[PDB]
Design a binder for these strands. Structure first.
Ligand code: K
Ligand code: K
Ligand code: K
Ligand code: K
Ligand code: K
Ligand code: K
Ligand code: K
Ligand code: K
Ligand code: K
Ligand code: MG
Ligand code: MG
Ligand code: MG
Ligand code: MG
Ligand code: MG
Ligand code: MG
Ligand code: MG
Ligand code: MG
Ligand code: MG
Ligand code: MG
Ligand code: MG
Ligand code: MG
Ligand code: MG
Ligand code: MG
Ligand code: MG
Ligand code: MG
Ligand code: MG
Ligand code: MG
Ligand code: MG
Ligand code: MG
Ligand code: MG
Ligand code: MG
Ligand code: MG
Ligand code: MG
Ligand code: MG
Ligand code: MG
Ligand code: MG
Ligand code: MG
Ligand code: MG
Ligand code: MG
Ligand code: MG
Ligand code: MG
Ligand code: MG
Ligand code: MG
Ligand code: MG
Ligand code: MG
Ligand code: MG
Ligand code: MG
Ligand code: MG
Ligand code: MG
Ligand code: MG
Ligand code: MG
Ligand code: MG
Ligand code: MG
Ligand code: MG
Ligand code: MG
Ligand code: MG
Ligand code: MG
Ligand code: MG
Ligand code: MG
Ligand code: MG
Ligand code: MG
Ligand code: MG
Ligand code: MG
Ligand code: MG
Ligand code: MG
Ligand code: MG
Ligand code: MG
Ligand code: MG
Ligand code: MG
Ligand code: MG
Ligand code: MG
Ligand code: MG
Ligand code: MG
Ligand code: MG
Ligand code: MG
Ligand code: MG
Ligand code: ZN
Lengths: 110, 51, 97, 166, 206
RNA sequence: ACUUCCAAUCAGUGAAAUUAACCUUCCCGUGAAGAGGCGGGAAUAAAAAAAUAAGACGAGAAGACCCUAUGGAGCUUUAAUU
RNA sequence: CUCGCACACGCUUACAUCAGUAACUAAUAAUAUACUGAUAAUUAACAACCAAUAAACCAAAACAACACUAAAACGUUUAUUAAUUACAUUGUUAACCCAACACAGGAGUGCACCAAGGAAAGAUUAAAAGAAGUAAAAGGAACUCGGCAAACACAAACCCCGCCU
RNA sequence: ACCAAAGCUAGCUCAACAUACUAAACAAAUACAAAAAUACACCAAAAUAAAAUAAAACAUUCACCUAACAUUAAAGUAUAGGAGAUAGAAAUUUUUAUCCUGACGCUAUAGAGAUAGUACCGUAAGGGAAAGAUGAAAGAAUAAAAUAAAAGUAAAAAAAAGCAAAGAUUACCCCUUCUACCUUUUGCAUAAUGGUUUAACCAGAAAAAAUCUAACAAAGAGAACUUUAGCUAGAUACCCCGAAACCAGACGAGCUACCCAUGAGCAGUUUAAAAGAACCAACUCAUCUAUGUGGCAAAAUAGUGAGAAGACUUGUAGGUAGAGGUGAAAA
């Protein structure tokens, strides 16, 4: 079908500015206690997660160099140790990942 | 249909154009100060004395 | 319909130059000259229009008669088409007839 | 083309006599030739009218529109101008007084359909204009109450005069 | 190397093959033609290096030295008299080296200055009995010598040192030509002892 | 009944036929003889999204049918001229 | 999930290295075989170019032994001449060509069907209508112009018009 | 407030004068498939122009329409014409040289098509564009000045009811009164035609007889003619867009119809068979239905089908050209 007449701008403005078609505001925005940036209540902080993801990639990159083959996987548990630390008695019998940087604050040793 | 945009402004400098100036730039005054005078630290108190 | 927004430089025309002061001086050469030169022997312009007047058809015909052999190929063709169209329009068209 | 929004920041007002009310700051900023469309950019501009700059950035932080990032950059760089180029302290004391979207220069292309037909394609470009004014945001107007409607109606019935009287 | 220019062109104190000129005038543009009064090469009495006096502008009555002449638009550029100020060093976080720049002047605003009285005087070319074209003043009636100016190369022939690939003046002016009626082909062949016996056959030209 | 491509919501790019102005209802009557607009009455806060195609004599092609034009052309011959 | 390598014909640097993409090109983004700037490249053995006259000679290709009817591309030797003298010239890239498009179309030969080449879904919800596919109670053409379409069927016979390919 | 607006040059037109008329560039290569130094040749040619149109049809005829050596008159006269349309001379007459040339011609939708026969669309003949704006200096781009005035949007979505307006009113509506505009018709709000809106551009033209004004008047006119108040001069006049067609000369058989050269394909299976036999692929046609209908596609995709050792498919290259070619006739 084809339109019969040109829509006037008075009609178009009513349709294009109806409250349904407008952008709704968000009232669930909060400041992250740790870093002070912005995040939603039900969503993890973007800055804090990006902080973790960068560190996780570095740890995984070190693991790749410790298993050259593409089908080599450990048969035991894994523990990550940073500079200035030594494996504990309970941590023995597990593969050791060494990182040169100082242990990050958020990461907690057990 | 084959119409595009023009007028993107950028400032590029090379040694060659600067060395090819037919008339060298004339400077009315020098750039820096030849020697900086070093006043004695007591001028804040000597200024209160006339002679 | 946008008009210019700046006043143009006014044309300072001098009414007393050589052309305007001496305009139409020898128009009465025949009257006051023992009738030796008709005033039509002062007209400057086309060869076929010195001292002659006519409508569009008689002008194109006259041009072809005098300077027809001196015209260019393309100009000679365009003149022929103009003569034919005017001949057909003036005689075979119109209101009063 | 026309560029008058940029030149509004060069207006210098005469010095104020002592005792006069403090003049709130006014910062005019804009961005030209944004790839985003004119109509789509308008909804984002309508969103942040009348809100303070800090909550205006918060709303545009999580918006999924491609223009949300573009507007947030404009507000951030306009805030830096306000606190440095102008003597506006308290960089959190600004509110978006006016925001709107204009149309730029379009590029025309050919869009093919089939059967040897074609349609002219318009590459869309839009501008964004924002004005920041120092001070707390103005309070939004509440709907007229029951007493307000009654007061206007009684006043209307009291303005009546004898039509075609004498 | 010679650079071809469009039939209509605008000159702005920049050489045609410069990046500044290309930035100012892109190859795809053409502007309005300015009115330039025609001066024949025999009527241009203003050269580069002679003192001239500025008549009109912010500075009037001052004298200076001509450094550049634009023959295409009939311009003479004095050395730092009709000056406007611009910036040269520009970057994101720094600006400086404020350098005055001299604006062009037309021929009608510049009159040549006689060496003796140091006043502007009309100049007309005259042909003397010695066969040399020397400019002659109107009021004082004294001739004005040509303004010897250093060339654009910046090399003075008076002070020069011959390099490894430079020919000495003695060898350059040494004459060894013996004008005989043998071509260069014949002379070299007999100089090195190249001997040829057979001759070419008949070849038809058409 | 159940899957995939469509579909509806979100993000990016973004076309076409169409369009006198429209603030674009129902019924009966009238009327260039089938009315959203006239007359007599009824109904009637304003907008958005998704659907079904009765009407806008819907959109598309200056009707192929039919006739007219001292307007054309193809074919055939016992038409006229040759 | 499967049209893959190469030559001929065509196109003409669209190929390669490095850098940039606010915008232009890709019908979007990342990004770069496809847009911009600089630099660089295809090396002949393969292919093109690559003698004349006179004379002898009825006897097919099809594994060709020997035959068929439609009677068949495909040359050697003798004689008379032929500049005789390292290295000549030219084609060597590609994701490509003809269709207004980076189009589900059109495109000859050799060898493989892969050891090679590629990605049907941008993210969700799982309404109607529409397209494509699978399955079904009892009945099995009751549908409809017609058994059109679909099918666990893949058969038998009559007539009309043309003989048949 | 965006989009936009404004400018005056580039050059062009019509003449005049005028040398006397294929410019500029030609180092090398240019009619082998042009721009490729180099081998026994063939080389070349002409036959009245026709028709669209006018006669309201159309057959004899139809100005200019290739080749005139002009102007003032004889004259639109003698003559030639389906004696219709219209065509139309001559005898005999007139004409004093050089300068005085420039513009009551246009100014970027104008003027040449032109910034250019270049991009681009066509195999080819051929068709053929849009596009420029600062200032004395941008070697004054933290750069400057100017209108902020077209449609379209933003600033500022809408509140019963009606050709959107008018009469008004303290008050925007509410009330009352009014069947859009042109064209075409006996008659249109008509559900008859055309237009989304804006800017630019686009369509009445001729002086025989006449009327008005004036000069001079039995005579008028700066020769040639008209004259029983007439003669000379001025002023007052008659459009634009559109067919199917017709004729002449070019360019097209790289798609397709047919043919001449030169090549290349047909595996398996069944039979004494390479038999215009049979089953079934590659390959070639396109039966039926469904999607698609500005689509992937200006004829396709999916399923299903017919031929598949022949009157078969197919590559390269050549031949036949419009009063024709070609055709296992479907005009
Ligand atoms: K007439
Ligand atoms: K309907
Ligand atoms: K190519
Ligand atoms: K039946
Ligand atoms: K109709
Ligand atoms: K009509
Ligand atoms: K009309
Ligand atoms: K051929
Ligand atoms: K297709
Ligand atoms: Mg196509
Ligand atoms: Mg449109
Ligand atoms: Mg559009
Ligand atoms: Mg969307
Ligand atoms: Mg309504
Ligand atoms: Mg009715
Ligand atoms: Mg009523
Ligand atoms: Mg009514
Ligand atoms: Mg929808
Ligand atoms: Mg709907
Ligand atoms: Mg209606
Ligand atoms: Mg209907
Ligand atoms: Mg219709
Ligand atoms: Mg009709
Ligand atoms: Mg019929
Ligand atoms: Mg009749
Ligand atoms: Mg007829
Ligand atoms: Mg006819
Ligand atoms: Mg015919
Ligand atoms: Mg007969
Ligand atoms: Mg191409
Ligand atoms: Mg892509
Ligand atoms: Mg890269
Ligand atoms: Mg590249
Ligand atoms: Mg496409
Ligand atoms: Mg995909
Ligand atoms: Mg999708
Ligand atoms: Mg469904
Ligand atoms: Mg089934
Ligand atoms: Mg069942
Ligand atoms: Mg039945
Ligand atoms: Mg039934
Ligand atoms: Mg049937
Ligand atoms: Mg079936
Ligand atoms: Mg029967
Ligand atoms: Mg048959
Ligand atoms: Mg039979
Ligand atoms: Mg006729
Ligand atoms: Mg007629
Ligand atoms: Mg004729
Ligand atoms: Mg007779
Ligand atoms: Mg033009
Ligand atoms: Mg104009
Ligand atoms: Mg406007
Ligand atoms: Mg009303
Ligand atoms: Mg009526
Ligand atoms: Mg009627
Ligand atoms: Mg009438
Ligand atoms: Mg109508
Ligand atoms: Mg009609
Ligand atoms: Mg219409
Ligand atoms: Mg008369
Ligand atoms: Mg005829
Ligand atoms: Mg013909
Ligand atoms: Mg062929
Ligand atoms: Mg076989
Ligand atoms: Mg068979
Ligand atoms: Mg198929
Ligand atoms: Mg199918
Ligand atoms: Mg099926
Ligand atoms: Mg079969
Ligand atoms: Mg069979
Ligand atoms: Mg031919
Ligand atoms: Mg024929
Ligand atoms: Mg056939
Ligand atoms: Mg038949
Ligand atoms: Mg038939
Ligand atoms: Zn955080």
């Amino acid at each position: 079908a084809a339109p019969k007449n040109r829509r006037s701008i008075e009609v178009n403005r009513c349709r294009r500015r109806n409250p349904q078609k407008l952008i709704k505001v968000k009232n669930n925005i909060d400041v992250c206690p740790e870093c002070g940036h912005l995040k939603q209540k039900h969503i993890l902080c973007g800055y804090c997660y990006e902080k973790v993801r960068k560190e996780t990639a570095e740890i995984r990159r070190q693991m790749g160099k410790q298993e050259g083959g593409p089908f080599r996987a450990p048969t035991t548990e894994t523990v990550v140790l940073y500079s200035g630390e030594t494996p504990s008695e309970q941590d023995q019998g597990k593969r050791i990942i060494e990182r040169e940087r100082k242990r990050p604050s958020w990461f907690t040793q057990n | 249909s084959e119409k595009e945009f023009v007028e993107h402004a950028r400032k590029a400098g090379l040694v060659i154009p600067h060395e090819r100036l037919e008339r060298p730039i004339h400077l009315a005054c020098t750039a820096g100060i030849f020697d900086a005078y070093v006043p004695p630290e007591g001028d804040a108190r000597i200024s209160s004395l006339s002679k | 319909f946008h008009v210019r927004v700046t006043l143009p430089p006014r044309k300072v025309v001098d009414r007393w130059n050589e052309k305007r002061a001496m305009f139409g001086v020898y128009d009465n050469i025949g009257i006051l000259g023992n009738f030796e030169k008709h005033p039509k022997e002062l007209i400057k312009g086309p060869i076929w229009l010195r001292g002659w007047k006519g409508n569009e058809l008689q002008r194109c015909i006259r041009k072809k008669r005098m300077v027809g052999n001196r015209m260019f190929i393309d100009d000679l063709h365009n003149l022929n088409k103009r003569i034919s169209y005017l001949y057909k329009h003036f005689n075979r068209h119109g209101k009063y007839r | 083309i026309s560029r008058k929004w940029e030149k509004k920041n060069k207006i210098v007002y005469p010095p104020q006599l002592p005792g006069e009310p403090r003049r709130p700051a006014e910062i005019y900023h804009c961005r030209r030739q944004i790839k985003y469309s004119k109509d789509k950019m308008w909804y984002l501009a309508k969103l942040i009218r009348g809100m303070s700059i800090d909550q205006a950035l918060a709303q545009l932080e999580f918006s999924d529109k491609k223009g949300a990032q573009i507007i947030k950059e404009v507000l951030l760089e306009a805030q830096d101008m306000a606190v440095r180029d102008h003597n506006v302290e308290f960089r959190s004391n600004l509110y978006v007084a006016e925001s709107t979207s204009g149309r730029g220069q379009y590029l025309k292309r050919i869009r093919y359909h089939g059967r040897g037909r074609f349609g002219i394609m318009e590459k869309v470009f839009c501008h964004y204009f924002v004005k920041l004014v120092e001070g707390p945001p103005p309070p939004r107007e509440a709907p007229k109450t029951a007493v307000a409607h009654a007061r206007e109606y009684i006043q209307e019935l009291r303005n009546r005069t004898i039509t075609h009287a004498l | 190397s010679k650079v071809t220019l469009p039939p209509n062109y605008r000159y702005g104190m920049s050489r045609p093959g410069s990046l500044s000129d290309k930035r100012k005038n892109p190859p795809g543009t053409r502007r309005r033609r300015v009115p330039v009064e025609p001066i024949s090469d025999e009527d241009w009495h203003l050269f580069c290096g002679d003192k001239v006096e500025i008549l009109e502008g912010k500075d009037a009555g001052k004298q200076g030295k001509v450094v550049q002449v634009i023959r295409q638009r009939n311009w003479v550029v004095v050395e730092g008299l009709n000056t406007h100020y611009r910036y040269v060093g520009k970057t994101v976080d720094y600006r400086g080296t404020m350098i005055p720049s001299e604006a062009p002047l037309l021929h009608n605003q510049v009159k040549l200055v006689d060496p003796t009285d140091r006043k502007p005087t009309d100049v007309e070319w005259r042909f003397t009995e010695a066969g040399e074209r020397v400019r002659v003043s109107t009021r004082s009636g004294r001739i004005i010598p040509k303004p010897e100016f250093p060339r654009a190369d910046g090399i003075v022939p008076e002070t020069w040192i011959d390099g490894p690939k430079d020919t000495s003046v003695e060898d350059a002016l040494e004459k060894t030509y013996v004008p005989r009626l043998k071509t260069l082909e014949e002379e070299v062949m007999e100089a090195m002892g190249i001997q040829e016996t057979r001759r070419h056959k008949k070849v038809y030209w058409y």
